Amino acid sequence: AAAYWDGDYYVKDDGSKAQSEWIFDNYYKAWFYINSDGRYSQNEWHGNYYLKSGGYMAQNEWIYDSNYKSWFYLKSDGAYAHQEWQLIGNKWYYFKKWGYMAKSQWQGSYFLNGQGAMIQNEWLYDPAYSAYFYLKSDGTYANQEWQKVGGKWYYFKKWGYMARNEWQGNYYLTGSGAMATDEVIMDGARYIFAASGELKEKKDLNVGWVHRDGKRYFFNNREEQVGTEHAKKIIDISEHNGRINDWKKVIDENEVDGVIVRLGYSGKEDKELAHNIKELNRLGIPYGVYLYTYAENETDAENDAKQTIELIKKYNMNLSYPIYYDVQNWEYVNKSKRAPSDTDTWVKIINKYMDTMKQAGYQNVYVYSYRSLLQTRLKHPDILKHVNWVAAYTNALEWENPYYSGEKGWQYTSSEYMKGIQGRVDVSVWY
Ligand SMILES: C[N+](C)(C)CCO
Ligand SMILES: C[N+](C)(C)CCO
Ligand SMILES: C[N+](C)(C)CCO
Ligand SMILES: C[N+](C)(C)CCO
Ligand SMILES: C[N+](C)(C)CCO
Ligand SMILES: C[N+](C)(C)CCO
Ligand SMILES: C[N+](C)(C)CCO
Ligand SMILES: C[N+](C)(C)CCO
Secondary structure, X not given: OOOEXXXXXXXXXXXXXXXXXXXXXXXXXXXXXXXXXXXXXXOEEEOOEEEOHHHOEOOOEEEEEOOOOEEEEEOOOOOEOOOEEEEEOOEEXXXXXXXXXXXXXXXXXXXXXXXXXXXXXXXXXXXXXXXXXXXXXXXXXXXXXXXXXXXXXXXXXXXXXXXXXXXXOOEEEOOOOOEOOOEEEEOOEEEEEOOOOOEEEEEEOOOEEEEEOOEEEEEOOOOOEXXXXXXXXXXXXXXXXXXXXXXXXXXXXXXXXXXXXXXXXXXXXXXXXXXXXXXXXXXXXXXXXXXXXXXXXXXXXXXXXXXXXXXXXXXXXXXXXXXEEEOOOOEOOOOOOEOOOOHHXXXXXXXXXXXXXXXXXXXXXXXXXXXXXXXXXXXXXXXXXXXXXXXXXXXXXXXXXXXXXXXXXXXXXXXXXXXXXXXXXXXXXXX
16 A cells, blocks of 8 residues: 555655665565665675565574574574574574574583584583583583493593593592493502492502513413513504604613504604604614504505505614504594495405515514404404404403414503603503
8 A cells, every 4th residue: 555665675655765774564574674775685684683585584593694604593683693592493502792603612511512502411522622521411511520321420520521540539430431330450459349339449469560580471460471481572652652762761661672663554654753763773672563554455455565665665674573564443534434344355455465565575464453353353264364463451362363373462551651751652562
């Protein structure tokens, strides 16, 4: 009867065109903003309000704005939510200054996931703080308190840091954070815990590298001698240990018989390789080397072998210990690729590496891996025949390999501290 749309323009009750003003259209039951040129706004903002395609003011709804690359939420009056929480579709969301939805980030004691929702009853590893946090049922981080999560007990310190490798009263939180319910061997002692977690007893032990009756032996955490008086202490080092300031100190003070040096991984040289080889050669310290593989197939394996050979000659390496193909359940950082799961593919990968190295004149070449992989994915006679260095950070290795006989190593720890090295060190007993 009265006001009406004329293309981009709006003719009001008085017969004049709208200009620089909001109008409410009863037919559409929506608000529209008319600009100074008399045309309605659309697919754009006006102050605190967003005008959708066709001009309709957004209200009680999400809008994704591709210019800002952000979600926004327009409230009951159309105004964007900002510096405030909103319960939407039965989930809590936080809006920052200027209305940008919070995502993958903290808001005080709450954490918003990648879709903006406040998380509840979830673990969060936050690399920004380098620790685990647990967001409770109410969304707040567990703090100075116990929480039972998935059948196990965890303790959270001040500021919510998950306790690990440490005591909280009568309870010990293990490396996973889980409360000990069994036994823990540490500090040269065995700690015995009730099923409910409380410490019951501590029994002194004399395990590890021990000098007894004029000779040196290695005892596992079951107090069993591993090897003979000639058992050797071998560390393995990489750029991850940083630059070693004084190698001679490391060797003498820790009684280290030899070193396995990381070459790098498929396609990349280790940052400390050059320095490590230089020093180990200069001091006549016995060493071997290892390459962490990201191989998927035989081509990758032959390339791994070529890289290995290239580095050996480049640095004039004098190899007292073997060349090691370090085989693990690898996965790219960006998760774009992961190791082949089938045994037969690894049989081909491993044997191509071996054959290539052998053809190049290197006969002292073996596989390193961890016990569980060797019991599963790598359990094949043509793989196991090459395996003589095995990782298991356990009380005993208790693993048999009928396919290899001779000198071998057990990497029993990745958490040893040694004089002259910053941080934790991998150590093996060679027997
Ligand atoms: C709602 N407008 C009339 C402004 C345009 C869509 O027909
Ligand atoms: C306040 N506006 C007129 C801009 C619309 C919502 O009420
Ligand atoms: C919603 N923003 C504040 C990001 C733009 C509109 O003024
Ligand atoms: C629209 N969001 C993705 C921001 C939340 C609702 O799924
Ligand atoms: C609105 N808060 C997120 C702050 C509390 C609701 O869990
Ligand atoms: C969990 N912290 C308290 C450490 C940071 C976020 O508030
Ligand atoms: C804290 N979690 C149990 C989730 C991780 C242990 O590594
Ligand atoms: C991206 N990564 C370094 C994990 C893969 C190496 O090929």
